[PDB]
Design a protein around this ligand. Structure first.
Ligand code: HEM
Ligand SMILES: CCCC(=O)c1cc2cc(-c3ccncc3)ccc2n1CCC1CCNCC1
Ligand SMILES: CCCC(=O)c1cc2cc(-c3ccncc3)ccc2n1CCC1CCNCC1
Ligand SMILES: [Cl-]
Length: 411
């Protein structure tokens, strides 16, 4: 029995996500075809010209793929499942220079070096400054009475986390945030004029200059840790640091931002959860917010050899697309997945990916950011109420909210 889906439906179709999350369609696959070939017509494969991909909709299959990185490659085709249909293959293969799109052993060496910048000590050291900034952001927004929750609440704190992690001076954070914002969303008409190619080049150039400068004058931020050789002589080259910063500018910006926006959207839809949050302030809320928001709808892998996955024969060279948005509502794993429950514990969501070599290195920085900003929202605008429906982002792999008008005072 084939799944009940519109003909030619592509789960990476940006025109879908500009309007809605295809929640019913994902649930139909989970019930009727949990691993399903998503065919793609000629020239409509978002930069990939192989006829289609395997849609992966169950959490256990997402985890099995993520664990078997020896078979399911990030390097072969990158992990972004959709670009502009016209993108040149060389523009996809340039993504291989960031650690996200690397396989072992190159990924193994890089991740070990990058780990110096994401130790619990390195992240926890940002706590106090990010808490202060979260409080000031929410106070400034509440003083405005009403406005765009996305721009006035969700946007700044994730960017300040990247800036503080890297130790970017305050006078430079303006153009750093601009470059980071010009990296994503260019298939939405609102961002048709952004140039991620130019921005990534500017980010790399800025980052190399910063690596050269930071080598001359070490400090305590992670940049010194990254470019300092260890006992084995391992360190980031200047351009390697540049590719790290470009990855960070994307990895930590719109992901946490959209978790914040869609976390508040869930709170507006479930006022009992919001009342419970304001009273208890449970930090388990962050993980339920990420599960609910699933800012990365999907990442892909490519099979390096034949592999049988849950009774389905994946053939060498074929792409599998891990739909975290489907897996995070898998009825087999979650008790009442469609109930927003900020006390859910344990919460084995795959919003940060499936356990494995590429698991989000900034997951705890993200959770801290989310907890600090929602404590600040609760402190300064506890009676927030939405004014109109959110405006969704036209993207085939990012689940984004561009704008969301709310009344911070409630009256
Ligand atoms: C709610 C916020 C976030 C979400 C939902 C998220 C999601 C993800 C996902 C799905 C992956 C791929 C995992 C895999 O393929 O197995 C990933 C990797 C990564 N994330 Fe995040 N992320 C978030 C925040 C952040 C932040 C704040 C940072 C850093 C400041 C960060 C840095 C990274 C990096 C560097 C990688 C690549 C790791 C590797 O390939 O080894 N992320 N993230
Ligand atoms: C890496 C140094 C700058 C650069 O050069 C370059 C950046 C860049 C970015 C994209 C892109 C990013 C996100 N979304 C869509 C596109 C595409 C191409 C990019 N490039 C050129 C790389 C080519 C590699 C082979 N030689 C000629 C240059
Ligand atoms: C050298 C050019 C790098 C680049 O360009 C790029 C980096 C990057 C990082 C992520 C990411 C990493 C970890 N966690 C979440 C996200 C995702 C995409 C990334 N890219 C390509 C951006 C394209 C822009 C145009 N639309 C398709 C994506
Ligand atoms: Cl994008």
């Amino acid at each position: 029995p084939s799944p009940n889906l519109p003909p030619g439906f592509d789960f990476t179709d940006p025109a879908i996500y500009a309007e809605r999350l295809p929640v019913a369609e994902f649930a139909e696959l989970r019930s009727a075809a949990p691993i399903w070939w998503n065919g793609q017509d000629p020239g409509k494969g978002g930069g990939f010209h192989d006829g289609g991909f395997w849609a992966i909709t169950k959490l256990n299959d997402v985890k099995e793929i993520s664990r078997h990185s020896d078979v399911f490659s990030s390097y072969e085709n990158g992990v972004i499942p959709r670009f502009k249909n016209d993108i040149a293959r060389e523009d996809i293969e340039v993504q291989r220079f960031v650690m996200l799109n690397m396989d072992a052993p190159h990924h193994t060496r890089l991740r070990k070096i990058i780990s110096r910048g994401f130790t619990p000590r390195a992240v926890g050291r940002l706590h106090d400054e990010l808490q202060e900034r979260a409080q000031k952001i929410a106070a400034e927004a509440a003083a405005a009475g009403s406005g765009d929750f996305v721009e006035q609440v969700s946007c700044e704190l994730p960017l300040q986390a990247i800036a503080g992690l890297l130790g970017v001076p305050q006078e430079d954070r303006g153009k750093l945030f601009h470059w980071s914002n010009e990296m994503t969303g260019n298939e939405d008409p609102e961002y048709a004029h952004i140039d991620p190619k130019a921005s990534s080049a500017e980010l790399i150039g800025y980052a190399m200059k910063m690596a050269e400068e930071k080598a001359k004058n070490p400090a305590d931020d992670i940049v010194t840790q990254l470019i300092q050789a260890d006992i084995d002589g391992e360190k980031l080259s200047d351009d390697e640091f540049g590719f790290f910063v470009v990855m960070l500018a994307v990895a930590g910006n719109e992901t946490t931002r959209n978790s914040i926006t869609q976390g508040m959207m869930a709170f507006a839809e479930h006022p009992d959860q919001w009342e419970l949050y304001k009273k208890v302030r449970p930090e388990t809320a962050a993980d339920e917010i990420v599960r609910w928001a699933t800012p990365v709808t999907a990442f892909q892998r490519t099979a390096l050899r034949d592999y049988e996955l849950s009774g389905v024969q994946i053939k060498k060279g074929q792409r599998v697309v891990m739909f975290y948005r489907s897996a995070n509502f898998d009825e087999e794993v979650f008790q009442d997945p469609f109930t927003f429950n900020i006390l859910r514990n344990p919460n084995p969501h795959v919003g940060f990916g499936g356990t494995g070599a590429h698991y989000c290195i900034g997951a705890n920085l993200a959770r801290m950011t989310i907890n600090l900003i929602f404590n600040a929202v609760a402190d300064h605008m506890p009676d927030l109420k939405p004014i109109s429906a959110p405006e969704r982002l036209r993207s085939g792999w990012l689940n984004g909210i561009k704008h969301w008008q709310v009344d911070y005072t409630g009256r």
